């Protein structure tokens, strides 16, 4: 899908894309994560997460009879913003197995008014 | 779909089952849910899923540029295990939004060895 | 189709079907028929209803020139409900062409509440 | 689509763009829309038009027997310019529902002199 | 298209027709018409739409690289009203391309409820 | 076309690109024009050629009975490099027909080799 | 091509038959030629037309990324003439890529009749 | 293809691209060519790599009945790297046909870590 | 493909089969594989090889978003020859991931040349 | 089925062949067979497997209701190996249904080495 | 068709081949054939039979109206036997009809057991 | 081409083979090509033919308007006898572009006497 | 086929034509015919060829398993040269299976030299 950005990455992860005026809001459902155990990294216009679920654990007495859950070990994502942000203060939250980055947009790349008629 | 055990509900939520000797570990992704809303039923070969997650919030300001999480609201499964279970003491985690139900089964649902010549 | 129940029957003969905690209430369209003149019959987990409409009243002076409605006078309906129900305490009410009927559920098939942590 | 710009947004707003030496005319059509609730944002070669107009009041007592208006009330569009325009000097007039945008391109990407030898 | 009225012109002029029990509210979209320019005749049943937008002009130093907007510089319609209406105090107004008349209704229209028995 | 350059125009004009460690070199054919009347614009890395020919020069005594030659009088193209050059001491060179146009890339686009180990 | 008149040749090379009243011009467009390398034969009503272009000469230091130009390093036409030409007298020029072919005199052809008296 | 990445070039010449969080290793498979023939070139975001195998020789006496190798003689690639190089430092290595090149990125480039309160 | 010769394997290794009067000439494309870890064998009219290329080494902080290299760890070929060898004293040579093996043909299966009158 | 080696026979009796640098290791799987029912030939480069399972023998007083059990009562293969044997010293095991052979392969066929350098 | 064998011919010649341990016995219906007229061919592992019958004899008085038996008076068959035979020991019956030959083989091919342990 | 012997080659020559009792006639033309450089090898059931025709030669004056005659001058055919051949007593005559060669066939080849029985 | 000349004959009789400035070379394949057999009528601008070789004699003992050379006997072209020829001085050769014939032109058609320049 291309619709102004490009997207990218490995496994099930289906993410949405929120825009403000100041700031691009970012939000990933990562399902069956550990707190520690993600990575997140962005730069300029470009965002990436890294993720690695640990496997449906079973003993040996028991068996899969019927899982439809995806099975992928490693799954990551890439996503070039629209616009550029400030990597310092860029700030996130996990909750419930879902990923909330607040990403603040470079004064530079902020749009500006235009007056009307 | 039949393949030993009936799966049916209204919406996306996906389900593992695993089978073991004395009792079934049921998986079930609830992704971006809060822990007090969700509800569960148990009887006999039946159990049953509600759930409810919350509506992405948007600011004034801010618009969803691209959003394919799907955006129902309301989600339920109901599925008949292979053997019934004793619900009375049943029990279930749920963290990182992975909802992780333990069923004993019944007596006379568990299987006896069988000697060999 | 199959989604947990069965549904099977002839004629028209549109209904709904409502499945609550402790009782399932079924309403059922029947225009055109008196009250006396509808019968129910329920019993465990099957349901099934039958009907039989007045034919039209036309007097000879005038004609039916068109009449979209069906005109199969005979009509019946079969539904096997998910669960056993009390059919000895069930009830019903009847108006303005809109059958309700509630049927309680057995204590066995009434799914109890399983808590989580 | 794409046919050498890329033009995104939501809902029906039919725009013209004109492309010239020293500046880039964008006329946009916002039928049945009030002036004060416009918005328009830019920066370098990107302009996106925000808009919302009142939905099809009806009164009580009257009910819509034919309207193929789209009922869309929130539209907005953005559009990459090919070549960069300086906001501070840029102006839009806006009549009788009709838009009419005036960008002055940037010096760096003006067309200058190749000898011709 | 005959949805108890019939509808003819040319060129594209959403319109939406609002049928109340006393008079009759026509909305019409005239983006990019001068004021000047537009002129009804209706009588009876019968209403009349005609107009003549301006064309694009363009200067010589720039060109077109994408016009969507309609070419069409001559559209009318003229669309048979279901009910006779008192064109003799009728009123219309016109703001922002949107036309709206509105068309009280022979009394012989008129009809006033009926209960029953 | 997409193959790591963009091309477009209007018109009978066939084009050659050569690209050099140093330089880039176009060859355009532009047969039947004068040499005062050829015009070409550049600017970083776009590239816009316009030419105007002149027309089919007949006398009244003689006919046209066969020609596959294009009349189209008005002819323009427009390819963009993928470097930027240095219009400024750019130069061309124009014989037989045959327009070459040598483009001298910029520093920053100017590639480098490293020592193979 | 048969249309009435034979065309025959290699290459690309577009031609303009004129059938005069007195001479023939017909014009080939022989595009990237040296003066002293275009060899012509004609006689009777019939014209061969034989060129071989210079190859695209290309430094070591440079390679073609993009070429439509026929390479095609020998290109012929020949076609028969609708009148007998006398070969003594006929005269052409070549600048700009244009060939241009007069063949002043049809002996045979001159329709000077005579002195009604 | 477009995956992030553009790959252009032309012949055989496989090639994976290994991404770190400082530096960007590519890997070309070069099989039966000469160190001292191939040539590498790149700068920002483009790297592009020139070579030529010799020709497969054959004696007088003998002639190959079965080949599949393929036979261009002239091959090379040009890939969109995803961040700007210190070619300055960069070094590369070839061995048993594999051509490794070491990139390290760009301070720009140089993603950094956020915070996952 | 069966042209005479039967060919057999796994993985991808291309090859070519060069034949002479006295000698086959065998070219086998092996990149990408140590010295040490080839091993030819070959008997009558029968060659077999046998290798196992290194995977990609890399390390845990760098990640694979481009490899169209082919992963297979095990590869193998085994070709019937037309005619019988002298693997006794038959040799070969490897050089930049190509394998040149040259097997004189048995003096039994060498062809006599016949004269023609 | 031709990929170097012949397989024939009728029935269903699945075989793997193991090929190693001084004997073949056949597989062949007879579930269901007495030991000294089946038949073994093999010469030069010929193996035969000829066999046949005894009926499922049914009581008077039932019935196979299902039964996906191949019927065919007699079943044999022969397959040409890819080398001579030496079948006086060969030998088998059959254990748990299935036949495992060893073959000696003759001399002639003992693949030798030839140096890589 | 390949299934260890070749069978070739001309005509209509039906045969059957049966294979034994120590012989060959083939079947080869000639209906019409006197037996001084039958001829065999045999070597190695090749076996052709050529045969022709005599025409249709027919009286004066008498005519043909319908014969389906094959007019082609000329007929031949060759096949090839999976083993070398002995045919100097080679012995043969013919009687109604139906060519009876004994084939032994040759010991080279005589298929040896192999004790199952 | 299989159709119970091989042929294998390159270019356009048309052969023959006739299957004899006690020889082989094959039958090979070579137009345009001299006699001291047609070349023939055979061995065993093995036969391979090499030739080499100038091209067409043409003056530096004249041009080929028309020539069906393929280009094609390296040619080759090798074919699988049937039968093995005593090449040392081998004959071949090749005269006006026709070649004949005549191969009488081993004594192993060579039919044997039947019993007719 | 019109490529100039009319092509016109039966039986596969392979011709190239090369028109000279003074004479038109004509290059016939006439493989298995004798010199005494040929013969040839040309005038003008028109030459026909006719042939007919031996029969591919067979002797009794042999067979044609397969033979591809053409069985036509009787083979026959005439071509319509475009230019006429003074046949009373031609000459021809004939070798190897190769119609050499050599026309020079009537200076009618000779088209003399044009001399611009």
Same mark, same amino acid.
């Given at each position: 899908s291309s619709t102004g950005i490009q997207i990218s990455g490995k496994g099930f992860m289906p993410i949405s894309i929120?825009? /403000?005026d100041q700031h691009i809001k970012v939000i990933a459902w990562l399902p069956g994560v550990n707190k520690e155990d993600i990575i997140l990294n962005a730069v300029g216009d470009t965002l990436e997460i890294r993720a690695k679920r640990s496997p449906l654990m079973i003993t040996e007495s028991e068996r899969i009879i019927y899982s439809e859950i995806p099975e992928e070990e490693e799954i990551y994502r890439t996503i070039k913003l629209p616009a550029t $942000? !400030?990597?310092?203060?860029?700030?996130?939250k996990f909750e419930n197995g879902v990923? @909330? $980055?607040?990403?603040?947009?470079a004064? @530079?790349?902020? !749009?500006? /008014?235009?007056n009307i008629e």
């Amino acid at each position: 899908s291309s619709t102004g950005i490009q997207i990218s990455g490995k496994g099930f992860m289906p993410i949405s894309i929120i825009e /403000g005026d100041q700031h691009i809001k970012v939000i990933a459902w990562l399902p069956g994560v550990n707190k520690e155990d993600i990575i997140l990294n962005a730069v300029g216009d470009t965002l990436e997460i890294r993720a690695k679920r640990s496997p449906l654990m079973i003993t040996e007495s028991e068996r899969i009879i019927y899982s439809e859950i995806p099975e992928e070990e490693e799954i990551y994502r890439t996503i070039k913003l629209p616009a550029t $942000v !400030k990597e310092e203060n860029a700030s996130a939250k996990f909750e419930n197995g879902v990923l @909330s $980055v607040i990403l603040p947009k470079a004064e @530079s790349s902020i !749009k500006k /008014g235009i007056n009307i008629e």
